[PDB]
């Protein structure tokens, strides 16, 4: 998750 | 050494302009006040062995090692302290190159100004510099362990207050385009622009990214179903949760090979890539089931081909990168054993979340993967061909990205744009598996594997095997389509004596146009017709409230000297910067001791005007008119005297001035005169009796005229603006109760006292006056207030503000009494024999003033708080  | 005060400046400030991030400390030199470095035993050697890097400081000599020569000749410790602070935060990787040291008015205190990159890091460096210097002067050296501890703390502070590379790139692009950006305090959100023109991002999600699209992208099966319903070639797959369903699912997918993956996982936990028989499928299913958070497992057909990551911004394909997994090539007749560490010794590879190319981690799982390769450690590659270490094709493992943006087939571009629009994402990262991205996904058996919201473009701005793509530029184009910044018109009003009235008049005039005006004044912060916040609200902390409101179209900010001194300006630039006047009244506060320093401080607003903006200056004030130079953008003069030579010369070559010529507020556009109003039909001027109100009206009218506001709107706003309690809280307020009249004002300095007298002296009735001043002002100011009150009034009631700001109680009252006594003794005959008495309570003072008001008299009140006088006169009808 986050900056995939 | 004793640190007395530590302030941080975040915008244009007194010390510098274009150097927004500064820290200023009041440093007390209790014992080393006049001790030079040459007179301190062993100071130079200890300092130069503690920090040899100081040899790089090109000081006032301007040559390599000049600061060292300055220390040699003997220098004050403030200079070496600022230099050691610069070097201390420079060693931590933060480049800073600004520093100043000044002698304050008080005896033993210096002011030291240090440029910073991080606020906490800058404050820590400033605090540590004095400790380092004190340790050097006390012992001759600083311990290396403490120096390393301080550097590690500085590095930790730099890392902690750092954005991510995606946010860093987007913010850098926004800065390059001149679009303002601020950091919100909630969820690491960055706000671009101001008011109604603002946008928000977190890392890659924008404020226009949909919840539904993100949630659909996060759902693998839902995304596959939606894309299949749209004809997009997704892989043929199925879901399974029990062991017995595996064989049926494998039959459904169409045979072998297949892929087993978990529904929910991170970093590809328990995902097999290629299995071709039963038993390996069983162990892969067990691994994925124990890796999934919900026990359920996807099984799909395996599709051969390379893995590409396609970035789609605003429905357009911006970058395409093929992910080649970790591999080595034996073209130099060398095997795996040498190359695994040969690649690791390349400067491109690095760890953390900054260097995208990671070291080739030889894990036990990686050992197993290279076991399935069919070769071994020393098995030399055949012919010099690629041999892989893993199959996930990820940068974290140590793989590479190859730019393929110029080779993607146009049909593929259309299909991927459709995929991004169908899912509902403005920025999307699509994973494609295909043998050739240059051919349509129908000819080859290419598939869309997944869609990712908030993708990282870290591999597209540094492919390492191709051309970098400006992803941040594309994002900023999506956020701000044209050549448009996110700015709204900002009008910053500064000056000594008319900021609040001018700000309110400007707000009213712009309100005449159909625009929502957010303006901050001394009374409070307003948005449109409603009060958004109470209090003083004249610093940047209240400018942020206006500039971040999603409904504000024009910002009008009263910029007092206090906010500029404390933390600078709340904005980088202003569309209009108005300077009304600079009078040396409240000197001594801060480092401001001369009227030249006060003019320099108030000139920050004038020098912050953008090149397309305007600076509205008082031509009648020599100090304000001196700000004509060193101003980027046009200059517009306003003068109460129509024969001002400077204003006339300015209008002859160019124009854009404002004057009060023949009972008329007029705008000069060069050789053209445009009259607005008779200045007796303007209520605040009080039939032209108050000249200072006319000057404020001139400034406001010129400011709105420079921005293209129609003359009709200016006229309507000037006519409909009232100087009563309904609009003006305590500015030139008349109250009529029949027998006499009450004037409540906000006069607390000699200049406003003179302006007040210039209108009061015309009243034909008795003059009673309650005067006072803040306790943090100089004694001479109180004497001037007393003598002016003696000159203008007939009955004097001296009161001292309850919030005395540290001054002993009473002192100001008896000193105003001394001033009134001096003025009384300066008169020979009974020309003006005004009676004087002092009571220190606001309620008692106003009650006494209102009790003995004769017929047709005028009672002037200058209270600490306007609401007190308003309530007291409202109660008595
Ligand atoms: N059906 C498939 N056919 C061929 N290759 C596939 C298939 N499914 C996945 N892959 C490959 O495996 C990689 C990882 O697949 P993902 O669907 O991303 O699994 P994951 O659990 O989401 O792992 P991450 O965290 O997204 S990298 C893809 O980038 C493809 O290279
Ligand atoms: N152009 C002017 N020149 C001199 N005195 C003025 C001028 N405009 C207004 N004044 C007087 O100064 C008083 C105080 O100024 P205001 O405009 O009410 O507030 P202010 O200028 O913001 O003062 P501060 O900085 O908030 S304490 C007013 O009540 C007027 O009597
Ligand atoms: N890639 C990432 C996107 C999840 C949505 N992001 C936020 N911040 N809600 C993921 O978890 O797959
Ligand atoms: N992926 C994202 C991570 C940085 C944002 N997260 C936090 N905690 N600041 C990025 O910006 O690349
Ligand atoms: Mg993926
Ligand atoms: Mg994914
Ligand atoms: Mg004010």
Automatic annotation (TrEMBL), chain B:
Domain ATP-grasp: 224-480
SUPFAM superfamilies the record matches: Glutathione synthetase ATP-binding domain-like (SSF56059), MurD-like peptide ligases, catalytic domain (SSF53623), MurD-like peptide ligases, peptide-binding domain (SSF53244)
UniProt binding sites for Mg(2+) 3: 500, 522, 558
Broad class of enzyme this protein falls into: ligase
Family stated for the protein in its record: In the C-terminal section; belongs to the MurCDEF family.
Pfam families listed in its UniProt record: Cyanophycin_syn, Mur_ligase_C, Mur_ligase_M, RimK
Function (record text): Catalyzes the ATP-dependent polymerization of arginine and aspartate to multi-L-arginyl-poly-L-aspartic acid (cyanophycin; a water-insoluble reserve polymer).
UniProt binding sites for Mg(2+) 2: 431, 450
EC number: 6.3.2.29, 6.3.2.30
Binding site for Mg(2+) 4: 500, 558
Subunit structure: Homodimer.
Tree of life domain: Bacteria
This protein's record includes keyword Ligase: yes
Keywords assigned: ATP-binding, Ligase, Metal-binding, Nucleotide-binding
Record organism: Trichodesmium erythraeum (strain IMS101)
Protein name (database record): Cyanophycin synthetase
Binding positions for Mg(2+) 1 per the UniProt entry: 266, 450, 452
GO function terms (MF aspect): ATP binding; cyanophycin synthetase activity (L-arginine-adding); cyanophycin synthetase activity (L-aspartate-adding); metal ion binding; tetrahydrofolylpolyglutamate synthase activity
């Amino acid at each position: 998750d986050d900056d995939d | 050494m004793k640190i007395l005060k530590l302030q941080t400046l975040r915008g244009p400030n007194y010390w510098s302009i274009h150097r927004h991030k500064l820290v200023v400390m009041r440093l007390d030199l209790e014992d080393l006040y006049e001790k030079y470095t040459s007179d301190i035993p062993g100071f130079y050697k200890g300092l130069t062995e503690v920090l040899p890097s100081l040899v790089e400081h090109l000081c006032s000599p301007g040559v390599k090692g000049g600061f060292l020569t300055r220390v040699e000749k003997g220098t004050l410790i403030g200079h070496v302290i600022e230099h050691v602070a610069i070097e201390l935060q420079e060693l931590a990787g933060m480049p800073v190159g600004f520093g100043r040291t000044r002698e304050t008015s008080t005896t033993g205190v210096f002011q030291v100004v240090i440029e910073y990159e991080n606020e906490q890091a800058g404050r820590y460096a400033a605090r540590a510099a004095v400790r380092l210097c004190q340790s050097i002067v006390d012992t001759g050296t600083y311990p290396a362990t403490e120096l390393q501890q301080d550097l590690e703390d500085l590095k930790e502070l730099k890392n902690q207050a750092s954005l991510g590379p995606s946010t860093e790139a987007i913010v850098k692009e926004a800065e390059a385009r001149g679009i303002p950006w601020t950091q919100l305090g909630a969820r690491f959100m960055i706000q671009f622009g101001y008011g109604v023109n603002q946008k928000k991002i977190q890392a890659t999600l924008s404020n226009q990214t949909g919840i539904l699209g993100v949630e659909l992208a996060c759902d693998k099966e839902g995304t596959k179903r939606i894309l299949k319903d749209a004809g997009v070639p997704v892989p043929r797959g199925t879901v399974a949760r029990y062991f017995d369903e595996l064989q049926d699912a494998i039959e459904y997918v169409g045979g072998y090979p297949i892929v087993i993956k978990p529904l929910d996982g991170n970093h590809g936990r328990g995902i097999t890539i290629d299995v071709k028989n039963w038993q390996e499928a069983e162990e892969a299913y067990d691994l994925a089931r124990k890796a999934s958070k919900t026990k359920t497992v996807i099984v799909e057909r395996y599709y051969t081909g390379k893995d590409h990551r396609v970035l789609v911004v605003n429905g357009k394909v911006v970058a395409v990168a093929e992910r080649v997994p970790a591999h080595v090539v034996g073209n130099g007749k060398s095997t795996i054993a040498e190359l695994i560490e040969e690649t690791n010794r390349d400067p491109q590879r690095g760890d953390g979340h900054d260097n995208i190319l990671t070291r080739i981690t030889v894990d036990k799982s990686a050992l197993d993967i290279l076991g399935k390769q069919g070769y071994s450690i020393d098995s030399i590659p055949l012919k010099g061909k690629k041999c892989f270490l893993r199959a996930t094709a990820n940068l974290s493992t140590g793989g590479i990205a190859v730019d393929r943006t110029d080779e993607i087939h146009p049909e593929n571009v259309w299909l991927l744009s459709r995929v991004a629009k169908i899912i509902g994402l403005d920025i999307a990262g699509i994973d494609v598996v295909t043998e050739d991205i240059s051919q349509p996904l129908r000819e080859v058996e290419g598939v869309i594997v997944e869609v990712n919201a908030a993708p990282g473009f870290r591999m597209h701005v540094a492919p390492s095997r191709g051309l970098a793509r400006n992803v941040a530029g594309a994002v900023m184009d999506m956020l701000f389509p044209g050549s448009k910044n996110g700015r709204i018109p900002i009008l910053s009003v500064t000056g000594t004596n008319g900021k609040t009235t001018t700000t309110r008049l400007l707000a009213h005039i712009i309100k005449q146009t159909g625009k929502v005006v957010g303006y901050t004044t001394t009374d409070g912060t307003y948005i449109g017709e409603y009060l958004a916040e109470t209090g003083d609200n004249t610093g940047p902390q209240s400018a942020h409230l206006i500039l971040s409101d999603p409904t504000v179209e024009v910002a009008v900010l009263e910029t007092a000297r206090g906010g500029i001194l404390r933390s600078g300006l709340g904005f980088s630039s202003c569309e209009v910067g108005i300077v009304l006047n600079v009078t040396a009244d409240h000197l001594g506060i801060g480092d401001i001791d001369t009227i030249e320093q006060l003019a320099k401080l108030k000139s920050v607003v004038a020098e912050s005007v953008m090149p397309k903006g305007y600076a509205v200056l008082n031509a009648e004030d020599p100090l304000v008119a001196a700000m004509a130079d060193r101003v980027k953008g046009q200059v517009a003069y306003f003068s109460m005297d129509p024969n001002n030579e400077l204003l006339l010369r300015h209008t002859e070559a160019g124009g854009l001035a404002a004057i009060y010529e023949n009972g008329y507020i007029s705008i000069l556009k060069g050789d053209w005169t445009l009259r607005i109003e008779k200045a007796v039909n303007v209520p605040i001027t009080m039939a032209g009796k108050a000249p200072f109100m006319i000057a404020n009206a001139l400034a406001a009218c010129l400011a709105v005229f420079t921005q293209g506001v129609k003359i009709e709107h200016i006229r309507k706003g000037l006519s409909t603006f009232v100087a009563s309690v309904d609009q003006t809280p305590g500015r030139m307020n008349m109250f009529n109760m029949g027998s006499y009249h009450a004037l409540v004002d906000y006069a607390h300095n000699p200049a406003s006292y003179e302006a007040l007298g210039g209108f009061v002296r015309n009243w034909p009735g008795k003059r009673i006056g309650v005067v006072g001043g803040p306790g943090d002002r100089r004694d001479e100011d109180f004497v001037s207030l007393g003598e002016l009150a003696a000159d203008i009034f007939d009955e004097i009631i001296i009161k001292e503000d309850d919030d005395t700001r540290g001054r002993p109680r009473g002192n100001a009252a008896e000193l105003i009494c001394q001033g009134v006594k001096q003025f009384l003794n300066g008169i020979k005959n009974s020309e003006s024999k005004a009676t004087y008495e002092s009571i220190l309570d606001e309620t008692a003072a106003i009650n006494t003033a209102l009790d003995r008001a004769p017929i047709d008299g005028l009672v002037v009140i200058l209270p600490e708080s306007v609401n007190r006088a308003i309530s007291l006169i409202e109660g008595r009808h």
